[PDB]
Amino acid sequence: MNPFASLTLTTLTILTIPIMMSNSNIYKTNLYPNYVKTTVSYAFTLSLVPLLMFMHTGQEMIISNWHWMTLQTVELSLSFKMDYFSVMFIPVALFVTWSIMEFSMWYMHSDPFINRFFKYLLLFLITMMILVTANNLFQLFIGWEGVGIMSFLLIGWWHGRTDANTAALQAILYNRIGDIGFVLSMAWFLTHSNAWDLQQIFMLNNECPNMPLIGLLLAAAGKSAQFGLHPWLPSAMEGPTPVSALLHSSTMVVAGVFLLIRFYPLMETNKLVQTMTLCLGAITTLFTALCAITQNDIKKIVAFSTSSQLGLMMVTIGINQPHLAFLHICMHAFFKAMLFMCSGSIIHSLNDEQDIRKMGGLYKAMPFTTTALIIGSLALTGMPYLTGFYSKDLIIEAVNMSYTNAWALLMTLIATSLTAAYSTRIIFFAFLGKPRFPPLVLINENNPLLINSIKRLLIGSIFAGFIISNNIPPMTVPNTTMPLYMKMTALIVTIMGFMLALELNNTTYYLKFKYPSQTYKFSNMLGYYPSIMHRLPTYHNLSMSQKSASSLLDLIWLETILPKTTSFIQMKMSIMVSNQKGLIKLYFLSFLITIMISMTLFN
């Protein structure tokens, strides 16, 4: 009966079998990574069927199978929402995870704890599937925290390195700052709508007030690393390259945008929250592209690229185009995962060397990675008829013809230009010049795992945009007629970015050297935000926590008030009472005084 629900639950259920077998014998052998990769591929090919059914008909279902608890009039049950977003995102996430795991079978070959690493990846995937398909706020919170904990564990994979632990704690801190707003939204919805279920929230909120939407926006900004809470994402590159390719590139970091998409019926009825979302997205994308333009670590550059793409996604949310933001999420998954794959291949081939100043001519020395990275860069820059076209071009067109801020539109255009610019920077400094790596050449691509994993996402980043765009039903009014210069604006700014970046990069060959300016120093240190906001607030909280909260109040004044005062007073009274010389003279003099007082004061 109606195989939609059975298949959708079966995929999530079979994703958990290797976790149960992690205590079996296969976990102690070297076949465990292949086992998990096979399980993920089977889950993907199984989940491909409900998407096909939705494409044919549009099937939509809610599954409330298990009832966990009921508090008075509020009923909490394990409910799964299997709408367009879920049945479209699950195949993409499973495909990317399968590719990344096949890549990790090669990349992490010498790591002693690879079974554990693979197990962790599976755990993260399970948590993300819980987050995506959740129907009420409690389950989505469960996934929200599970992905964060898996991020913490995978970032600090090399727990002997201090910086990895610091980056993991930084990610936890920023995600908790977002969790504050998440909890605020949950409390508001439970107090006013009397439910955490999405259906009741949609019924009882025709004009959603500012508070729950502001809480949701804070949570989305925290988990998607917007300008206020951005620095944790670039610092999350301390983990292994497959972790940065899976979690912090294409699957985990789109969780805030997905949360804002899930609550879009309430988002469109509020105009101030939409404005705040638009401004946040614009400032985030501009600032992150400006940071990316001048970085030397390739992983840092690509992470800032991911942050800028998330900013563009939240701009799309701000202009009231949620389905377009979902499409951009799906496209960015493909091409950004492939970009991280190429970067990791380059890093491994050069003896774990990440800086681009020490990599030269790789266009011919290793051509498959070169062509994959070129295709990914073209896709990232919205080249026509490429995966990035069908999302980014529509984003630019929709922002250009909407009643929005002029500043936000200008920032978005500059961000697109800077995107083309740092893509040019990556290509130029990684593939074109003369070699700059140490003489002992160990360059090698001839491994079937790496080639197959990269080429699957290559085919995806070439054709998935066309396929998905032509297979989904329409969900928004099109921009049929446009001014000719306004139609070409994305291409014009992108080509300007290529030309300016290439021209400025070609001057590095000239035999002249000058000290850097103030703008370069501002862009290189990421606007000095990490320095100031990681040295001033942390110091001021820790110093207070030690001096006032711990010493001054607790160890001194609270101790002085009750116990020390009581002890001092009692000891003084004891000394006064017991200090008697033992002379009956004074004793009976006091008795005489006492006797007189009793006679004259009590009658």
């Binding site: 504050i180 439970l190 107090t191 820790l542 207070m544 909260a549």
Partner: protein, 459 residues
């Protein structure tokens, strides 16, 4: 109720007539059996109560506390088996006798149909704990810690006896059922204000309320492992249970009386969470975390709403289990290093991986990771406080963030990094310690499957 009480009493002659080398085995087996008997009490009704007799009753507020109290004794025996190896048989039997007497007093305290009996047993629990702290304690500050623990409690609870005898002289009864059915409003009067204070302060001082929490770090740091376990798990919840039982007669006076205590708890959770960030001792850090959790429980009880009460019950149970596990882990480290300092032994995950897994799970549970019952209570109390006032969300979020911060700080400082070079006496973890951690942690994840068992009478 006697089917639980009588075997606990028979634990004493069995212990004193046991062989010199069979006290631990017999005590553990019979304590576990007693715990199984206690499980039957959980079945509860949506109606009044399980009124066994005129002396004792059971409720879905008392049942989880009784189950936890009965379950804690085998764990305390397992923890105490190690450091009492070089002790004479008579003194080990005396230690087991103290633990059994404490369990018996707690069991009779939690049923307690009549309030003076509740007070008598609530004070009788004070003696065995004091003897355990001041007799089997390692440092020289155990005497001062015991003095603080005794005198704070007694100064808090002496006016409660006067309040109770006055209430019985006026109303005529102290049976909780009659008190509930014949409740009458309290007029806003100075005498009523002082009666409210005398009824409330005794339970406030044992929570501990912020500013009256000084005794707790001393008592927890200087106590042996079993004493720390019981103090953190059960003895702190006596104040919450008493407040839940006694706030029925304090209405409508509680609406404005609660403000000084609400402000103190709301600011003190932030204060103690921040204190946890700068701490050089594991036990002190765990104690201050306990103070923060109990302050939030105080807020829940003072708000006095059904969601507040359910969250407070769930958080009490979850905090008891989590604090016991954390203290046990700290004791396992201490028995190897003999220092009790965070920065000395580092990078223990490389040497002890399974114990590092236990550390991670305990820290995650203390961090209130969903869907653990810790977060269930936390979230219910947060929602109730938000309904009380929308501005509480700032303090609650700050507390959550700082809590995650110091929990992961404690995990990272001890488990990650590079091992200390000069420490070479770190032997592999024994099966006893691993079983102790497993028996601490598995009930939490089993209880998260049936949260209605720990949500109290207002579920």
């Amino acid at each position: 109720m006697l089917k639980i009480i009588i075997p606990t009493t028979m634990l004493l002659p069995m212990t004193w007539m046991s062989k010199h080398n069979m006290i631990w085995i017999n005590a553990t087996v019979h304590s576990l059996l007693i715990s199984l008997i206690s499980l039957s009490l959980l079945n509860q009704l949506g109606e009044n109560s399980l009124n066994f007799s005129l002396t004792f009753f059971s409720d879905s507020l008392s049942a989880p506390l009784l189950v936890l109290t009965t379950w804690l004794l085998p764990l305390m025996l397992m923890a105490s088996q190690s450091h009492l190896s070089k002790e004479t048989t008579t003194r080990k039997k005396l230690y087991i006798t103290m633990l059994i007497l404490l369990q018996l007093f707690l069991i009779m305290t939690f049923t307690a149909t009549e309030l003076i009996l509740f007070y008598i047993l609530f004070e009788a629990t004070l003696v065995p704990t004091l003897i355990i702290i001041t007799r089997w304690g390692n440092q020289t500050e155990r005497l001062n810690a015991g003095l603080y623990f005794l005198f704070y409690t007694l100064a808090g609870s002496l006016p409660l006896l006067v309040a109770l005898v006055y209430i019985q002289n006026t109303t005529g009864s102290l049976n909780f059922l009659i008190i509930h059915y014949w409740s009458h409003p309290l007029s806003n009067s100075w005498s009523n204000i002082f009666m409210w204070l005398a009824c409330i302060m005794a339970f406030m001082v044992k929570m501990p309320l912020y500013g009256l929490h000084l005794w707790l770090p001393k008592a927890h740091v200087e106590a042996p492992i079993a004493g720390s376990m019981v103090l953190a798990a059960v003895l702190l919840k006596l104040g919450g249970y008493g407040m839940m039982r006694i706030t029925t007669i304090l209405n409508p006076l509680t609406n404005y009386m609660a403000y000084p205590f609400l402000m103190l708890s709301m600011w003190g959770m932030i204060m103690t969470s921040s204190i946890c960030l700068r701490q050089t001792d594991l036990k002190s850090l765990i104690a201050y975390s306990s103070v923060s959790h109990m302050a939030l429980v105080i807020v829940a009880i003072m708000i006095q709403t059904p969601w507040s009460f359910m969250g407070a019950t769930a958080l009490m149970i979850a905090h008891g289990l989590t604090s016991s596990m954390l203290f046990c882990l700290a004791n396992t480290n201490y028995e190897r290093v003999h220092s009790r300092t965070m920065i000395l032994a580092r990078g223990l995950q490389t040497l002890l991986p399974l114990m590092a897994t236990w550390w991670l799970v305990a820290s995650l549970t203390n961090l209130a990771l969903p869907p653990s019952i810790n977060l269930i209570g936390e979230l219910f109390i947060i929602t109730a406080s938000f309904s009380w006032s929308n501005i509480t969300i700032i303090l609650m979020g700050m507390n959550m963030m700082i809590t995650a911060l110091y929990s992961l700080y404690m995990l990272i400082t001890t488990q990650r990094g590079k091992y200390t070079h000069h420490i070479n006496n770190i032997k592999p973890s024994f099966t006893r310690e691993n079983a102790l951690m497993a028996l601490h942690i598995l009930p939490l994840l089993l209880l998260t499957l049936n949260p209605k068992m720990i949500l109290g009478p207002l579920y």
